[PDB]
């Protein structure tokens, strides 16, 4: 009955959500906040211990002349100060990125062809199982051939392993199930059938290297580390000479011919290797998120779990640290996963579409874009106008622009079943919002926004691309907060409405359907809340090798 | 022949040069002066002989603050410049009467080098210019002074810097207007990675010539990128003509009419009136006290609007004599004109979007800098397909001294050498002349 | 020029702010010295600092464009480029961020205008900025309760008003005096205390705010009911879309 | 006296080091080793916990058919199994890299000029001190201007700060010494005079971003994070508008015009941004190591401390993880920093040179190369022939090639005072060694070796460079273990013999002269030993924000 | 199809990417024009020809 953000607004402020007036300047600044108080005390201790001043609440301007708000993590009952959602302060957020960065998908199809056609040896489920036992010893950093090798401590690298999957049920069932991602167990029936049809008789590894290594090094380490230990394990398990000409075919296959990186490398101004956030296309991010296989009866929930995944990764870690840093961009992102606000607006749009068209029944054209995106934009903006507490909550125009346009673009794609018209609706939302309030976002917010309408349906070299293939390196998108995670949600929206098992890469979808990951990709917002509460247990720590 | 359009061409004083020139006579694909400019920019290198000499004498090689104590070499390079340059030229040329040029400047402190065009005809790209020039001068210095095998690696480091440990020629004492191929944002972008300040320096701050050079480079890149192939070709050619070549004296006349007291808004009003007078737009619909304009020729509307955009920059930043507001002109000229008319702005919103980011990235903590450090390859300013950066070049030409990162700060070596080249310095003149010459071959 | 479509009071007010032939209503008198103090760039009696020498002292070569474009007075002198920045409440302030930038580039020469949700800025040569700023401060661009002059710490455009009807200001630069019903500027725009406060007059009453505002809201005039203004925005979207394709 | 490696050999084996025969196969395989036993036990616990087999000593071949040796960390009396020197197992090694990766040097010279010219404001030691208070609050991730900012937890980011240095004693002495790297205090008088003359009146910031951020992100984050918070602190401390045109000059200066990265970005095949190991030139690595300012009366100690720094970073973390992974390359590197072996060989060469020529007094020519590098190569190789225990210790040919040639190249540079003839002596050592023993290193060891002589003195585009400017991205050096850290040592050698305060960049030398670093760069080998013993305390851990 | 892009395009180009870029866009446009592919669908033609560029 009540709008979904009402409970959160009543938690934040003494006044009712509709009340236009308040009183400021009475809360003692930072002293109102448990968290700021913890920080003041911690800064005193840090500075005293190290002999260099550090956090000081009297430098610059005095925070907390207004209420420093708690935020409800959407879909949860957890309320936290926003500092607990900063990626630096949230081990779940850090582990979510580590789990992506340290994963690669590596075929065994060329490799098995090299074994059969070149070594002249048979491959069967039994030989695959022996290989998998071998590579699960080797992958975390342990030896299989040479004498006098020194190895990683198994407990520091407990999170590293290799699993496989295949669309052939009878082959899957013959490999030892300790190593298999079971598509039939993880996915509902129709999605499982779709995914198994995509994979067919292909056999793919999901390799996760150690978090401690990924943190020491970078994302471009992942496919190399994977290949080295695949290589050693092919030597040991199939009885090669330990370094013969055929050894190089396994190297080329695992490093290049049948590897799938999570992210592609970046150009020099933003130089980075593979498996960094900017190289992860929006359709892969939607596929990494596992909401699709557990919340499939609710396409809004699926889509907004993807928005949460992407707003955090792309705005907080990527744009707010890799591409900038400092205090960063916590609340640019939290606006899309807190207080059930985006949820309220997107359920409105979903229901509007159900009533007028039926999901995926609207014509895939500009008429539908104009209808849906305009209606949903106006609903969202009316909520800020009706509820002064809501407007004071999402106080930055960029935050409001992203939230309103995400609901409009997801709703448009719920109607058409096509992400490209969803994207057109996102841009129309921005144009209407700008004219309604005579403001939009920060100084640079609508660079992509004003290029946006013309580039949705362009076909030119560096302009034309289906939304699912776009990502943080699409030129117009390469700089700015409040867009990338929302685009991942729009990419997910029509596929969730259609009941599709994946958005852009079925191997990526399957590769994260795995409870051996450290972060639980089925419930991204629940994990963010667990990390905010300091209740998440990450991998990669050095406690075992440092003083007690 | 492919297009029926004709344009009248003028000089940088607003005098008619040639009437009724076919549009394709200005195409990068047809105009021999644009070909000469582009091949000239591929092949030309500035060599700082004084800088090489000083780097060697102090052993300060390999990038900012770097020095190798004990490696100092004191060589009379500038005093022997004529000999060194001649010896370099003999290695650089292909044959003795080709188009290789090696010319000393500044009493031998600098050399202009133009590597023969024939090396490029059997090259994939343009890096032969710095690489052939660098090795020829390294070898010529070694041979002039009989530098030993033990020391000669310092000469190499003084000339070309930390390459190949660094990907760029980090610390080099040679410079080009182009930058290395690895720095391209996309394939086809090399003529876009030319600093605005370098264009302004080469054209000696003449506003119209700076805008012309920048437009020629930008729109030529649009051909190399494929953007000006097929459906879009006429749009790009008309942009080149009207925004960068002052076709029909439109930019010039708008500035004349608005220069004394005008604003961005007054230029918009005059451009809309002119488009109406010329039949480019017409009233489609009457709302309540508001005329909705239409066009049957979007490429031509875009070109008129682009000429107005350039004029607005010249009026707004010319009145301030301060370039920073170009980002604001580029934004609000386009935002205002859409609400004035009901027609799309220049480049169908892509100038306005480029301007939003460019404004942010020239007034914030996050990146960018002053207008002169941008270019068509910069992530902030790549998005419009040629219609934004030439205005930035015009604005920086009009800046009277408000910038720390001015062309005097960033582009002095380039200015000394590249402004010597007549077609780089005064391109509008040469391109108009070549168009008039080939007018009957189109 | 027609400036903006629509049939609401909002739309007419947007056109009036852009139209340099519309006489902005003057609501309050402020002295030259007080404009200088609020700007905070120089002290009373301080000569204009320079960033470069006067234009006349320069040896500029012939340039037809330069010759045709008259420099503003501060450019002739070599003045620094300085700024003035305003925050406008979403509770019906008269001016709003895009309204300002659009209007400034219609009305003023040599202007670098920037729009953001919580702040809007103009940068120009210092002596010219002082003349523009007087008009921004004295006229219906400004209300002393629902608008604020703020060079930093701008939060408040989207906040609830206080009990006096004043916008939030982390730095409390503008203080409502119950005894006069007038607002005083007690700090300059960057937040430093003024020797003596500047009278900014009375806040506009609700009726007058509604007559003068340029924001559309459900509790004022809603944008969705200004159907002609929405039509033009939609038209723009569609024409840009088609043009980018073919 | 005993050769310097005799103590270590006596600790490793029951036999005296000269004895030619032993007995094998009696030690119980892995069961001889405390560390392997720890690993076997951990592997069983890991596999049970997660439901996937992991470390298992019965996979592949049975380690420990010979003695699994302890290693003495050279210059220490610490003896550890080699697994305690693997970077994964050694928190000192990880922190050494984090401390480099998270550092950038950023001028204040353009910034102070923008303030004086565009803003028309004064800069003084007082405004600098206020700026430094401000930036030391902001840099770790705390706010100075906006309301309702959410911040990093000060205790998580206690390792991040900003100091300055300058050659102008008047300013250096007047700033709170909390913020100053004091050249007069940190360097002996002659070195201090050289360094101050290089810096002059320049003022430079040394910025260290948080280890937790560097680990979450990458090296290319560092200069961005630094610039954001310098930017905010310039706005707050100098009273700019918070985002005016001049703000962009501060950004361009801090990001591009006056930044010194530790490493430059890499080509696409090995795509990486700035501040990754492959971008760090050999002369910078020598300058990062701080042995030069403490051990200057002993050029061998300085040179070999640089070799230790580089062998670990370049072979273990860079080539052994970023560029490969798995078990990796611990002992390819430990050969250069254990058992006092390289030290024995290099002290022999230094004595040879000091007696025959005097340090830095030999002609800088091929005659000196032939004399010194030959004599030292034959000394090193003779030791392996005379001490069978030494040969069984440095069992891989690559290890021996690197060690013998490092001694020969450093000694040649001690004679000539020039790194380039040092490098020629390195390659000559390899050619002589190959002929003497009819072997050299692993299959690919001498790619650079065989190109080597011809490319030492080349002047061609991608061939010619003084050694100090070379690094891991010099083409011939881009792939292979057993060279890069040794080349850093050779780059250090002539400068250490000359008494030069730095090798290639004085700013980099000064920037690591700071006891507020987590790792102690004055005593790299001592630190590696402390990490091996599990006694080093790294930054970056998440314990404060995770459960008990 | 064998395609050889005219040499004159290269004489006014910095490098060689005009070959794939001019070819790709000519074939994208020719396919769209052959079948009257709609504005809504034409981006898939582009993807089929040139792939994930410019995200990759
Ligand atoms: C100095 C700038 C200019 C610049 O380049 N970045 C700033 C400041 C920067 C700093 C502020 C930290 C601090 O206070 O020390 C950080 C956190 C980035 C960093 N260095 O870590 C940031 N902005 Ni800003 N920035 C934000 C925002 C905004 C909104 C705030 C409007 C309001 O009414 O409060 C406006 C732009 C707009 O008007 O639309 C804005 C401006 C500005 N942004 C103005 C300062 C405004 C002021 O004087 O108060 N940011 C937002 O709109 C919300 C998210 C928020 C970011 C922090 C987070 O995401 O948690 C922060 C993101
Ligand atoms: C399979 C290869 C071919 C290849 O591509 N890499 C190998 C194996 C690889 C694996 C071995 C781990 C394991 O046993 O599972 C690792 C550790 C790399 C990784 N994947 O983590 C490695 N070599 Ni190898 N590799 C080494 C070496 C060597 C020496 C060993 C000679 C001897 O007499 O023992 C020889 C080359 C040579 O003859 O010069 C060698 C060969 C080989 N090297 C032969 C296997 C030799 C055998 O069958 O025993 N390495 C060394 O010479 C010392 C350093 C040592 C590395 C580990 C460390 O640095 O601690 C290891 C470095
Ligand atoms: C523009 C560019 O900066 P430069 O102009 O190259 O310094 C780029 N930064 C950014 O895009 C900043 C993005 C994150 C901060 C702003 C988010 S709205 C980068 O560092 O490569
Ligand atoms: O004020 S800005 O738009 O430049 C930065 C917002 S975080
Ligand atoms: O055997 S190889 O030389 O190929 C690898 C040594 S680690
Ligand atoms: K990392
Ligand atoms: Mg103190
Ligand atoms: Mg679980
Ligand atoms: Mg000679
Ligand atoms: Mg009428
Ligand atoms: Mg008056
Ligand atoms: Mg003191
Ligand atoms: Mg210490
Ligand atoms: Mg210590």
């Amino acid at each position: 009955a009540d709008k979904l953000f009402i409970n959160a607004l009543k938690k934040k402020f003494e006044e009712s959500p509709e009340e236009k007036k308040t009183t400021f300047y009475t809360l003692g600044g930072w002293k109102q906040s448990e968290r700021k108080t913890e920080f003041v005390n911690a800064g005193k201790e840090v500075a005293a211990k190290r002999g260099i001043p550090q956090y000081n609440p009297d430098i610059g301007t005095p925070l907390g002349q207004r209420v420093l708000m708690p935020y409800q993590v959407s879909t949860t009952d957890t309320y936290v100060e926003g500092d607990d959602l900063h990626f630096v302060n949230n081990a779940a957020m850090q582990q979510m990125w580590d789990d992506i960065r340290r994963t690669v998908i590596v075929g065994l199809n060329h490799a098995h062809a090299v074994i059969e056609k070149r070594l002249g040896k048979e491959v069967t489920p039994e030989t695959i199982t022996h290989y998998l036992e071998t590579v699960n010893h080797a992958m975390p950093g342990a030896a299989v051939v040479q004498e006098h090798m020194v190895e990683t401590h198994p407990a520091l690298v407990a999170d590293s392993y290799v699993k496989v999957f295949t669309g052939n049920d009878e082959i899957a069932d013959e490999i030892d199930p300790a190593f298999v991602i079971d598509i039939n167990k993880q996915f509902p029936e129709d999605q499982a059938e779709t995914l198994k049809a995509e994979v067919g008789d292909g056999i793919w590894q999901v390799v996760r290297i150690p978090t401690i290594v990924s943190r020491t090094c970078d994302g471009a380490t992942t496919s190399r580390w994977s290949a080295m230990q695949i290589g050693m394990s092919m030597i040991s398990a199939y009885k090669q000479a330990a370094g013969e000409a055929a050894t190089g075919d396994f190297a080329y296959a695992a490093k290049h011919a049948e590897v799938i990186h999570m992210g592609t490398y970046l150009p020099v101004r933003r130089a980075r290797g593979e498996n960094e956030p900017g190289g992860v296309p929006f359709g892969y991010l939607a596929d990494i998120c596992q909401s699709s296989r557990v919340n499939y009866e609710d396409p809004v929930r699926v889509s907004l779990d993807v928005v949460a995944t992407g707003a955090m990764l792309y705005d907080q870690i990527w744009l707010g640290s890799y591409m900038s840093g400092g205090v960063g961009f916590t609340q640019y992102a939290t606006a899309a996963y807190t207080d059930n606000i985006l949820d309220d607006f997107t359920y409105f749009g979903k229901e509007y579409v159900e009533d007028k068209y039926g999901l995926c029944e609207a014509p895939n054209n500009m008429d539908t874009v104009l209808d849906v995106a305009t209606e949903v934009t106006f609903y969202g903006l009316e909520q800020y106008e009706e509820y002064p507490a809501l407007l004071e909550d999402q106080f930055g125009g960029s935050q409001r622009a992203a939230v309103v346009a995400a609901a409009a673009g997801c709703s448009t794609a719920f109607a058409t079943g096509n992400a490209q018209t969803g994207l057109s609706g996102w841009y129309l939302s921005m144009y209407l919002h700008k004219e309604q309030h005579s403001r939009l976002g920060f100084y640079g917010y609508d660079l992509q926004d004003q290029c946006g309408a013309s580039n949705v349906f362009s076909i030119r070299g560096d302009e034309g691309l289906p939304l699912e293939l776009r990502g943080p390196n699409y030129p117009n998108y390469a700089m700015n907060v409040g867009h990338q995670g929302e685009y991942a949600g729009i990419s997910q929206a029509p596929h969730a409405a259609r009941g599709d098992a994946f958005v852009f890469n079925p191997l990526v979808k399957i590769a994260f359907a795995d409870d051996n990951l450290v972060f639980d990709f089925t419930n991204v917002r629940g994990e963010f809340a667990k990390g905010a509460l300091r209740e998440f247990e990450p991998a990669g720590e050095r406690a075992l090798i440092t003083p007690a | 022949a492919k297009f029926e359009d004709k344009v009248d061409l003028y000089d940088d004083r607003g005098n008619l040069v040639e009437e009724q020139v076919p549009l394709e006579a200005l195409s990068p694909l047809r105009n021999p002066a644009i070909k000469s400019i582009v091949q000239g920019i591929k092949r030309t290198v500035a060599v700082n002989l004084e800088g090489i000499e000083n780097a060697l004498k102090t052993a300060k090689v390999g990038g900012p603050a770097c020095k190798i104590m004990g490696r100092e070499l004191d060589l009379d390079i500038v005093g022997n410049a004529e000999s060194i340059a001649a010896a370099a030229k003999e290695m650089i040329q292909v044959t003795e009467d080709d188009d290789t040029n090696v010319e000393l400047l500044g009493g031998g402190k600098r050399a202009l080098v133009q590597v023969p065009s024939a090396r490029f005809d059997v090259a994939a790209e343009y890096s032969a210019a710095p690489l052939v020039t660098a090795t020829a001068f390294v070898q010529a210095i070694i041979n002039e002074f009989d530098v030993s095998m033990y020391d000669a690696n310092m000469v190499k480091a003084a000339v070309l810097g930390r390459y190949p440990q660094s990907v760029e020629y980090m610390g080099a004492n040679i410079a080009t207007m182009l930058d290395i191929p690895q720095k391209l944002e996309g394939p086809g972008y090399a003529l876009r990675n030319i600093m605005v300040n370098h264009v302004v320096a080469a054209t000696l701050k003449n506003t119209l010539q700076a805008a012309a050079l920048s437009t020629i480079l930008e729109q030529t890149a649009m051909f190399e990128m494929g953007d000006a192939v097929g459906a879009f070709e006429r749009m790009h050619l008309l942009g080149l003509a009207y925004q960068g070549m002052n076709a029909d004296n439109l930019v010039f006349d708008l500035v004349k009419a608005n220069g004394k007291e005008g604003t961005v808004g007054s230029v918009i009003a005059d451009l809309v009136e002119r488009a109406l007078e010329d039949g480019v737009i017409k009233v489609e619909k009457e709302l309540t006290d508001y005329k909705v304009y239409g066009t049957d020729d979007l490429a031509m509307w875009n070109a008129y609007a682009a000429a107005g955009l350039m004029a607005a920059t010249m009026v707004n930043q010319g009145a301030a004599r301060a370039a920073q507001g170009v980002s604001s002109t580029l934004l609000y000229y386009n935002d205002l004109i859409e609400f004035e008319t009901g027609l799309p702005s220049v480049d169908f919103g892509k100038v306005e979007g480029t301007a939003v980011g460019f404004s942010f990235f020239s007034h914030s903590i996050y990146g960018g800098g002053g207008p002169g450090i941008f270019n068509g390859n910069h992530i902030v300013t790549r998005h419009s397909k040629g219609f934004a950066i030439p205005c930035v070049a015009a604005a920086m030409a009009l800046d009277a001294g408000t910038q720390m990162f001015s062309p005097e700060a960033t582009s002095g070596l380039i200015k000394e050498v590249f402004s010597q080249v007549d077609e780089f310095r005064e391109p509008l003149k040469y391109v108009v002349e070549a168009a008039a010459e080939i007018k009957n071959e189109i | 020029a027609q400036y903006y479509p629509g049939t609401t009071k909002v739309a007419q007010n947007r056109r009036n702010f852009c139209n340099p032939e519309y006489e902005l209503e003057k609501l309050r008198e402020i002295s030259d010295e007080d404009v200088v103090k609020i700007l905070g760039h120089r002290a009373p009696g301080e000569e204009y600092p320079s960033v470069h020498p006067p234009l006349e002292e320069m040896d500029e070569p012939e340039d037809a464009i330069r010759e045709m474009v008259e420099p503003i007075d501060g450019a002739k002198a070599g003045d620094r480029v300085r700024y003035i920045q305003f925050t406008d409440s979403m509770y019906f302030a008269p001016a709003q961020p895009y309204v300002r930038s659009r209007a400034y580039l219609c009305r003023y020469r040599g202007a670098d205008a920037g729009t953001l949700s919580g702040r809007q800025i103009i940068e120009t040569r210092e002596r010219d900025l002082e003349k523009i700023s007087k008009e921004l401060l004295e006229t219906e661009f400004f209300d002393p309760a629902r608008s604020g002059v703020r060079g930093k710490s701008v939060h408040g455009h989207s906040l609830r008003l206080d009990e006096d009807g004043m916008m939030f200001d982390m730095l409390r630069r503008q203080i409502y005096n119950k005894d006069t019903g007038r607002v005083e500027m007690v700090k300059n725009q960057i937040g430093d205390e003024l020797d003596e406060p500047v009278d900014l007059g009375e806040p506009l009453d609700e009726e007058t705010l509604m007559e003068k505002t340029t924001i559309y809201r459900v509790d004022g005039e809603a944008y969705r009911d200004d159907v002609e203004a929405v039509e033009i925005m939609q038209r723009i979207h569609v024409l840009r879309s088609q043009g980018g394709f073919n």
Side-chain angles (χ1 to χ4, degrees), chain B residues 283 285-293 336-343, chain C residues 1-7 15 228 232-233 235-236:
Chain B
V283 179
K285 188 176 180 180
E286 298 278 356
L287 293 178
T288 303
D289 301 306
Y290 181 92
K291 294 170 171 301
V292 182
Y293 294 86
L336 285 164
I337 207 166
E338 295 182 338
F339 294 96
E340 182 61 30
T341 63
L343 284 171
Chain C
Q2 63 187 2
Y3 303 108
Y4 199 75
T7 59
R15 290 188 283 269
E228 298 183 10
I232 295 302
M233 191 67 265
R235 173 185 177 87
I236 290 307

Side-chain angles (χ1 to χ4, degrees), chain A residues 113-171:
Chain A
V114 171
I115 294 166
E116 298 209 318
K117 209 126 70 82
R118 204 168 163 177
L119 300 180
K121 297 190 141 91
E122 188 184 25
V123 178
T124 64
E126 178 187 16
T127 68
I128 295 168
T129 292
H130 176 58
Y131 165 78
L132 290 169
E133 185 165 31
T134 303
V135 81
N136 279 283
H137 166 83
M139 188 59 63
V144 294
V145 172
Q146 289 190 227
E147 179 61 283
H148 213 286
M149 291 301 88
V150 301
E151 300 169 298
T152 60
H153 190 310
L156 287 177
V157 296
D159 58 309
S160 176
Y161 58 89
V162 182
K163 291 184 179 184
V164 295
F165 59 88
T166 179
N168 189 308
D169 287 327
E170 292 92 56
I171 302 293

Side-chain angles (χ1 to χ4, degrees), chain A residues 13-17 19-25 60-67 366 369-371 374-375 378-379 382 384-389 391-398 400 424-425 427-428 431-444 446 449-460 463, chain C residues 4 10 14 85 87-92 95-100 102 112-119 121 123 146 150 152-153 155-172 214-219 221-225 229-230 233-246:
Chain A
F13 305 114
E14 284 176 6
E15 297 85 0
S16 78
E19 170 58 55
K20 282 194 164 174
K21 285 176 148 172
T22 190
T23 293
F24 302 110
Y25 322 122
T61 62
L63 290 182
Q65 304 308 304
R66 57 161 291 169
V67 170
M366 189 59 70
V369 171
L370 292 171
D371 180 273
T374 298
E375 183 73 22
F378 296 152
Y379 173 83
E382 285 167 5
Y384 297 115
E385 294 169 356
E386 175 175 6
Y387 298 101
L391 180 57
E392 176 162 325
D393 179 17
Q394 307 205 320
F395 57 81
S398 306
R400 300 194 296 278
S424 191
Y427 295 119
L428 173 62
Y431 305 150
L432 293 167
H433 182 159
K434 171 175 163 186
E435 295 315 301
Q436 178 156 324
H437 285 165
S438 198
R439 54 174 50 73
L440 188 68
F442 76 93
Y443 220 146
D446 57 319
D449 350 64
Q450 298 296 334
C451 293
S454 73
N455 280 341
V456 173
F457 306 109
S458 179
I459 55 64
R460 300 204 297 185
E463 299 169 358
Chain C
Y4 199 75
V10 164
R14 294 184 176 189
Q85 179 160 266
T87 299
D88 298 300
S89 180
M90 294 178 68
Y91 297 101
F92 303 111
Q96 298 290 335
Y98 283 110
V99 160
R100 289 177 180 279
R102 288 173 177 172
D112 178 10
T115 309
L116 308 81
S117 71
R119 41 174 292 215
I121 187 163
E123 303 193 43
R146 301 298 171 85
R150 310 179 176 190
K152 74 163 182 185
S153 306
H155 196 71
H157 80 280
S158 48
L159 268 57
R160 287 166 302 163
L161 302 172
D162 75 17
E163 287 296 338
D164 301 317
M166 296 289 290
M167 182 163 55
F168 175 89
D169 183 353
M170 190 190 202
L171 304 189
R172 298 201 76 181
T214 52
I215 194 168
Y216 293 106
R217 292 168 54 91
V218 70
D219 51 1
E221 292 169 307
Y223 177 56
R224 65 191 304 160
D225 293 332
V230 172
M233 191 67 265
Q234 292 187 335
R235 173 185 177 87
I236 290 307
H237 178 78
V238 172
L239 292 180
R240 284 178 171 193
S241 299
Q242 288 177 342
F245 172 52
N246 70 357

Side-chain angles (χ1 to χ4, degrees), chain A residues 226-245:
Chain A
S226 168
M228 300 309 91
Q229 304 308 85
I230 288 167
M232 290 310 308
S233 298
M234 287 291 173
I235 285 167
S236 178
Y238 290 95
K239 294 199 155 317
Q240 288 180 247
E244 50 174 301

Side-chain angles (χ1 to χ4, degrees), chain A residues 238-269 271-305:
Chain A
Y238 290 95
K239 294 199 155 317
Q240 288 180 247
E244 50 174 301
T247 309
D249 276 349
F250 294 106
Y252 182 75
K255 292 182 82 200
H256 302 284
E258 61 191 338
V259 72
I260 319 289
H261 286 108
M262 298 302 95
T264 50
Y265 66 86
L266 302 177
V268 161
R269 184 181 292 282
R272 259 97 197 195
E274 297 77 13
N275 277 32
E276 300 292 0
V280 180
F282 301 138
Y284 279 25
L285 194 281
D287 293 332
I288 292 166
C289 176
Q290 298 285 302
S291 190
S292 62
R293 70 184 177 81
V294 295
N295 297 303
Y296 48 87
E297 299 210 311
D298 186 349
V300 177
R301 172 62 181 254
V302 173
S303 300
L304 297 189
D305 284 339

Side-chain angles (χ1 to χ4, degrees), chain B residues 305-320:
Chain B
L309 176 59
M310 178 63 71
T313 297
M314 288 164 172
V315 166
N316 195 30
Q317 279 54 74

Side-chain angles (χ1 to χ4, degrees), chain A residues 84-99 312 317 518-521 523-538:
Chain A
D84 299 1
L85 298 169
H86 194 297
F87 82 93
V88 166
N89 302 335
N90 190 310
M93 293 176 180
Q94 288 174 44
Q95 189 71 48
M96 196 191 89
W97 172 231
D98 288 337
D99 279 3
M312 189 293 289
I317 294 176
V518 180
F519 185 96
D520 183 356
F521 287 85
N523 191 3
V524 169
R525 288 182 276 175
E527 294 288 72
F528 292 173
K530 186 183 300 169
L533 294 172
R534 303 178 184 176
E535 296 175 1
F536 186 93
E537 298 279 10

Side-chain angles (χ1 to χ4, degrees), chain A residues 267-269 319 323-325 328-329 332 431 434-435 442-455 458-463 473-480, chain B residues 168 182-185 189 225-228 232 235-236 331 335 338-339 347-354 356-361 363 366 375 377-380 382-385:
Chain A
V268 161
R269 184 181 292 282
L319 290 174
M323 295 297 305
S324 67
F329 300 150
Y332 282 129
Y431 305 150
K434 171 175 163 186
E435 295 315 301
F442 76 93
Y443 220 146
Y445 184 83
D446 57 319
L447 171 140
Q448 66 199 274
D449 350 64
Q450 298 296 334
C451 293
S454 73
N455 280 341
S458 179
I459 55 64
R460 300 204 297 185
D462 72 359
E463 299 169 358
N473 193 52
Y474 178 82
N476 298 170
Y477 303 168
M479 295 149 281
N480 307 118
Chain B
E168 294 172 65
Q182 296 86 351
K183 289 177 77 185
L184 276 35
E185 282 276 321
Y189 264 70
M225 285 163 57
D227 286 352
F232 317 101
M235 180 188 191
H236 283 282
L331 205 175
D335 192 30
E338 295 182 338
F339 294 96
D347 214 6
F348 314 144
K350 295 172 171 69
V351 178
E352 191 180 329
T354 295
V356 169
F358 173 31
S359 292
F360 167 56
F361 283 113
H363 301 77
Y366 295 101
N375 50 82
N377 188 71
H378 197 294
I379 191 50
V380 177
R382 60 179 289 202
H383 314 281
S384 174
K385 299 307 186 58

